[model samples]
Target: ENPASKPTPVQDVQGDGRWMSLHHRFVADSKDKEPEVVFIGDSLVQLMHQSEIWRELFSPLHALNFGIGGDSTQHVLWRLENGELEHIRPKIVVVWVGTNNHGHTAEQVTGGIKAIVQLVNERQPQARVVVLGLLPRGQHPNPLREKNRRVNELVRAALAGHPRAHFLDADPGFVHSDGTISHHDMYDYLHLSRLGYTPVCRALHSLLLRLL
Candidate 1:
């Protein structure tokens, strides 16, 4: 069985219970924000919210970022299953999760992403679901990066012919030909920097424009 596909809440290791709080906030935002586009995922999506690109491009489109730091696919599934996708009906639902599933295998992560896309399609029947492929991670060519690459490959193949849900690999040119990732693109090699967000935003903007 794929644990990654299960709708489970995230552990509060710090005892702060901030993850649940964020989920509740997102549920509340869903009721009032009435955004045209909803971006949901892990820290990559969460941090992108504060970027200049997000303000310039996504803000005008009335986009809401429901991303949470260190969120796995199960956590995101839980949020969606609870109340995150309730009141408002977004035109587009963008999902960019699965990278934080450290112990999970590529097949499992792919299953998790597929499950989310199916749920989104069911919950928001009119909304177009855009499932973002997992980006290559780490500063160098490592096992984890390879795993993410497999996830990207598997997820793409899994969603290839889906009518409503489409998978987009908005990688933003993070990897180099020499098999290395630049610090400029991803400062710590896991998260995107300001410069990195530019290309990603442009790619998403292009796709969103076409979808809309």
Candidate 2:
């Protein structure tokens, strides 16, 4: 194991409880079938555990959320390498990362995203990798949002021509008509509130139905 590849706080939380719960509920119940749909990301995906949206949306599909809070792309890569993608061969993989890579420039962010995509393709070539653009950060002004935009653009460009990859942009609905983040959508400039998550869940549900 790479010492540099220690699990992030998000990962620890998931590993200790959330991940175990998911495995107990699905993996334990379905002794005969494998999981078909999986969600991999950071805190945003972790939020799915608080609601039954994922369970309902993916009821027909064997879905699992491998989301951890405070995880950057590199951390996610390490998790996958360590064993996250071992038993389950998913049909659809929803990914939302790079938010934790905020301090990095577009190039750095793109590199991390690309590396993870490459790993996914190599490990699970049959899975459809859905890359979600980093959502807007409402706290800091100007440069921060600008940086995020550039990173999102890079992610879009990087995913081009990959038939198995689809990039989903969930920023528009979360923003105000005036190009600002809707206050009701976020408790902090960085985290989404229940109001914000509603639209995201809806959008993901629609996307999953259409894709599957």
Candidate 3:
């Protein structure tokens, strides 16, 4: 079986139960927020609320952030199935994950993302789904960076002609001609700094406006 495509919860790696707590919180938040846009995935999505662009753009759109740190596609599938997407019907469901699935191959990660997209389409037929491409990571070019690129290539092709889904490559020019990433954009070359989020969020905001 493909573990990446399976619906699984976090193992509580911190041993503090915080992951489950956040999942429950998101499930509860879904009940009354009536969000027009929902962003769900890993830290990349979770940390967006702290970015200036989020406040300037998505917040005004009644957006709800259901992001959690270190989440993979399986964790997200579990969350959506358990209740995160149950109570409210959003206009757009934005999904951006797969980077944290280090144990999985690019093909496997692409399967996981496709599974999540299928779930969203099945449960929220009226909502348009936006799948963001995986961004390049690390300070220097490496195997993992290539893996992310391959996943993006597969996902972008898979969703190309989907009727209600759009794949957005929101890499934001993070990679330089020298094949190195700057710390200014991604503080640790993994998580985006506030400056790193500007271009990405702007692209998403423009797309959201058109979708909404």
Candidate 4:
């Protein structure tokens, strides 16, 4: 059975005063100094902070992890609008969102992705946007996976002519041939385990090196 659908909390919304304060603090501390790369997403991006590879692979580059656990596309958009993009003008923005938007249909998720892409383009026109395809989840047999695929396709299509925007397909690397996620690559059939994270890091590292 799939895990319960846990949406991002109301407290995470942009109007939440406490959340805004914390976001301001993070931006104040991080905005200047020029990070080479910035990662924005949900818990998957957060997990990168705990990885040794993050230090090793991105050591030469100024890397920032703006991922919050349980964040949806809306939350990330809010963060960027509020403070996440305030001072840092990075060369690359690695985005891995929308996994938590599974409850919504593909069209809904695609709408969210479109809004995010528009926001990024408007906010940081010079930065390259790398949209990481949503990873597959093993526990759910719902149309969520299909929804993710549709959203990814829509993202690619929407950003097709935009030179600064690109799509990276990381899902297939971790998915089994049988169309399910490999158990070895996940914790609780959703998040990545250490083993799962290693290859992902390497893939991202390679992609960034090529793009950067």
Candidate 5:
């Protein structure tokens, strides 16, 4: 099989049964519950329900979290195709991904991200697409961090002309003047900790409100 044609990378191919199960549950929930806001991406968007801010604010808007930890751009593509968006015509779809594929080159990662964005536009043409710049990973500037910046650059440029989609790059929300990201921001310097979500959430929430 051509690796390039694979929809998404499955870190644990054998454990996909569990992934499929959750996907089905979310699909069912989307069908029955009909949420207005769908947050889909990697761990960053997945953990929103647990946040105090979410329960206090977003829950009232009838939000749903479709985040899957360790999912790259292509993985999301697979989820969407299989059933994630099967029944809901959400008003907003927030996509934040690609940080985990640092091993892949920026162009390849960007390609996958592009596919995800395009898929959302095609499948749910009415839903507004919010493309978050790949969040800053690693506590310090390193090769991987540089790669994140490159992917972000490409993603921003790619989304430049879209009518319904917009790009959000709130890098300053996470970085310190000393070139360090605190554990408070990202416990592993990758996944957002509770405190970390505030900045990024505020950044997106601001945009989300305007679009609505």
Candidate 6:
């Protein structure tokens, strides 16, 4: 195993009681199907599989969704190292993590995002990585959201260093001109709701098609 591919700042932090078990299930589930695209991240990505947006847009792509709620960048790093990323020749790997790493510095989270992209390239050199900017959280712009914005900026700059990595900024579609977020878009100001998913699906639709 390459050291650079290993999970960083290792912590046995489980998002909920279901983290490891879900990973195991995903591992077992992968033994059969060979997916062309894989989505890895936090609840935002995970819940998509169970949402109307997924059925309409993603389910047809034969993609694998490996989202786990409350996941930090290191937590996602742990997941990839354990088994979620094993032996796949996916054409695309969508990474949408780091929002949960509020306790860490912006630089740390940005570095973690870069580490994840490197890890994916290391494990699956054949795959193209779509590193989505961390979704802006909160009902309105604040320090937390600012931190995330910095993270996204840094991650995008890092992506330029990885030939196979692409950064997607899907934030502008999620908010209004006044900078206020709607509950319809993000019911809790953190996770995307059905209304929020609409813009996201529309924004990413063309990019994903071209990637495929």
RMSD of each: 1.0, 4.2, 0.9, 5.0, 2.2, 3.2
Model 5 C-alpha lDDT per residue in residues 29-139, reported as the tens digit of each score: 887888878888887778866778788667876788888887777788888887888888899888888887745788888887788888888899999898888877778
Give me the overall lDDT of model 2.
Answer: 0.72
**Clash counts for all predictions:** 0, 1, 0, 0, 0, 0
Query: Each prediction's Cα lDDT score?
Result: 0.90, 0.72, 0.92, 0.74, 0.80, 0.80
Over all chains combined, what TM-score does candidate 3 have? 0.98
- Worst lDDT 10-window in candidate 3: 49-58
lDDT of 4 by residue, 121-151 (tens): 8888888888887877766454666667777
Tell me the TM-score of each prediction against the true structure: 0.97, 0.81, 0.98, 0.84, 0.91, 0.90
Tell me which of candidates 1 and 4 scores higher on lDDT: 1
RMSD of 4: 5.0
Question: Which is better, 4 or 6, measured by TM-score?
Answer: 6
Best by TM-score: 3
Candidate 6 lDDT over 1-212, as tens digits, reads 33323475334565564666788877765666789988998888898888688878988888899888877887788788777777667899898888888568788888788788878888888999998888877887788888988988888888887777889988755556788788888999888877777777666766889878
| Top lDDT model | 3
Residue pairs with clashing backbones, model 4: none
lDDT of 2 by residue, 62-146 (tens): 6777777777877777767656777667888888888887556677877887778888899889988888888877643557677
Lowest lDDT 10-residue stretch of candidate 5: 1-10
